[PDB]
Amino acid sequence: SHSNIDYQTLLANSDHAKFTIEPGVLPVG
Amino acid sequence: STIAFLVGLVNPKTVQSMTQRAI
Amino acid sequence: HLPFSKSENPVLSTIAFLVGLVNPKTVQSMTQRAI
Numbered sequence: 001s002h003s004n005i006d007y008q009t010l011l012a013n014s015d016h017a018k019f020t021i022e023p024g025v026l027p028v029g
Numbered sequence: 030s031t032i033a034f035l036v037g038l039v040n041p042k043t044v045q046s047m048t049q050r051a052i
Numbered sequence: 053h054l055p056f057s058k059s060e061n062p063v064l065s066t067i068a069f070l071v072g073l074v075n076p077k078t079v080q081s082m083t084q085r086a087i
Binding site for chain 1: 060065066067068070071073074
């Protein structure tokens with residue numbers, strides 16, 4: 001079922017005017 | 030560079046701005 | 053950095069290749085003509 005861990009899909013869409021972020025991209029630097 | 034061409038000011042850093050630091 | 057010998061302090065991390073891969077995966081060019 002689960003693994004204590006969440007993930008991201010690849011089929012969603014964009015309002016093209018969002019205001020949300022997430023540390024799943026590793027822009028560390 | 031990013032700092033080598035800017036002082037007393039800088040791009041913010043929570044997003045992928047280090048792309049700049051590799052200019 | 054490399055254009056800046058002054059680099060961010062670290063003892064065990066990963067910075068440059070990280071954003072590198074982020075941009076890479078973002079390309080989605082599964083047939084990216086490139087190097």
